[PDB]
Amino acid sequence: MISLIAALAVDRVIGMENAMPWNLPADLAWFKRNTLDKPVIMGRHTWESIGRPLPGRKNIILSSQPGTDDRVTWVKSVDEAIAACGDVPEIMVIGGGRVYEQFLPKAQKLYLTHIDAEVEGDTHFPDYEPDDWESVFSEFHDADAQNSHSYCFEILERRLE
Amino acid sequence: MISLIAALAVDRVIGMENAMPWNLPADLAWFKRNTLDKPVIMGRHTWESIGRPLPGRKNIILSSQPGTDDRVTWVKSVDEAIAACGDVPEIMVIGGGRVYEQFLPKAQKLYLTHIDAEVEGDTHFPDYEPDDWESVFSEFHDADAQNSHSYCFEILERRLE
Numbered sequence: 001m002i003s004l005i006a007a008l009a010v011d012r013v014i015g016m017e018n019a020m021p022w023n024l025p026a027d028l029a030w031f032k033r034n035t036l037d038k039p040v041i042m043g044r045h046t047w048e049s050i051g052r053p054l055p056g057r058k059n060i061i062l063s064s065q066p067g068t069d070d071r072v073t074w075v076k077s078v079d080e081a082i083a084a085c086g087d088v089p090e091i092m093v094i095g096g097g098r099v100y101e102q103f104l105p106k107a108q109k110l111y112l113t114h115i116d117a118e119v120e121g122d123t124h125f126p127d128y129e130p131d132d133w134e135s136v137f138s139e140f141h142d143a144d145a146q147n148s149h150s151y152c153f154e155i156l157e158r159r160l161e
Numbered sequence: 162m163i164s165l166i167a168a169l170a171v172d173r174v175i176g177m178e179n180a181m182p183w184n185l186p187a188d189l190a191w192f193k194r195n196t197l198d199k200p201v202i203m204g205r206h207t208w209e210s211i212g213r214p215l216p217g218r219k220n221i222i223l224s225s226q227p228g229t230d231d232r233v234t235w236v237k238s239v240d241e242a243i244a245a246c247g248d249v250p251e252i253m254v255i256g257g258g259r260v261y262e263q264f265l266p267k268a269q270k271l272y273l274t275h276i277d278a279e280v281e282g283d284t285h286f287p288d289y290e291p292d293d294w295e296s297v298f299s300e301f302h303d304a305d306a307q308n309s310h311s312y313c314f315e316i317l318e319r320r321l322e
């Protein structure tokens with residue numbers, strides 16, 4: 001199935017997670033653990049922002065313009081992106097805002113890191129309707145030496161009911 | 162022992178909790194449940210802001226100026242406030258910012274509601290040093306129909322170790 005994974009500051013603000021306060025090592029470990037050996041779908045700015053494929057995974061880039069790197073697979077539509085992942089238990093949509101908004105209707109699971117911090121940005125995570133989603137897990141953590149804000153991991157699952 | 166109870170927006174901002182977004186009914190129930198039948202200590206603006214004693218409890222007001230209501234006990238110092246509570250298992254310090262900063266060194270427990278919201282304010286909860294405190298409980302909750310932001314209850318306890 002299709003899952004969205006994102007780190008959200010207050011007001012559901014997202015930004016390219018090489019800036020701060022998205023340099024939270026705990027979120028980085030959570031991200032790695034939850035995307036390990038799964039194909040990942042991303043947009044072209046996100047691809048530009050990481051500079052090299054995530055290792056040991058099919059990396060798919062969803063963009064209207066022709067590809068410029070043969071270490072990844074380039075596609076033009078959501079359905080081509082999904083077909084490019086093949087028959088796998090879980091596809092991880094990893095950014096950015098426009099890619100999140102195109103895959104939200106097909107997604108069944110959300111892996112959200114709620115970060116207790118304020119950042120300027122126009123880019124918000126899509127507005128998941130509380131009624132369509134059930135929170136199945138959360139785990140709060142204080143700020144510590146490695147992590148400069150408090151943060152909370154959350155997993156939600158789309159309701160049939 | 163002495164406990165501080167407070168609702169904190171992002172950046173540890175606090176404000177008189179009759180304004181929003183401190184009108185979160187879930188926080189109100191958490192507050193009630195954790196202060197029921199315990200004496201409460203508050204500052205004069207907090208006392209002004211509630212307009213009437215919290216029922217079924219000794220209400221103590223810590224202020225430098227003479228009292229103006231005989232339904233509560235007025236004191237001038239921290240030690241008079243604590244002595245006025247008598248021999249009880251738990252004293253609840255309920256606001257405001259200056260009262261929190263005077264009782265923090267004697268406190269052994271903190272009941273914090275972390276609210277996922279931004280509010281203007283100069284008044285911050287004191288800067289509890291992460292090393293002196295252990296988080297013993299947390300519980301995250303999504304925004305829903307009654308509660309307009311996501312929030313997390315937390316309890317911390319002062320370390321001897």
Ligand SMILES: CCc1nc(N)nc(N)c1C#C[C@H](C)c1cc(-c2ccc(C(N)=O)cc2)ccc1C
Pocket residue numbers: 005006007016017018022027028031032042045046049050093094095111112113
């Ligand atoms: C790790 C940050 C993150 N957290 C959560 N919860 N969800 C996400 N979707 C992203 C993300 C992201 C993008 C792909 C991104 C990743 C990285 C990144 C940083 C370090 C590693 C690593 N080598 O482990 C991988 C990717 C860098 C820039 C960007 C724009």
Ligand SMILES: CCc1nc(N)nc(N)c1C#C[C@H](C)c1cc(-c2ccc(C(N)=O)cc2)ccc1C
Pocket residue numbers: 166167168177178179183188189192193203206207210211254255256272273274
């Ligand atoms: C309920 C808000 C709150 N939450 C948390 N976690 N900690 C606190 N210390 C306060 C507080 C407070 C102060 C005393 C306050 C309480 C109230 C209030 C509102 C409703 C009731 C009630 N009748 O249950 C009681 C107090 C109103 C204004 C203000 C300045």
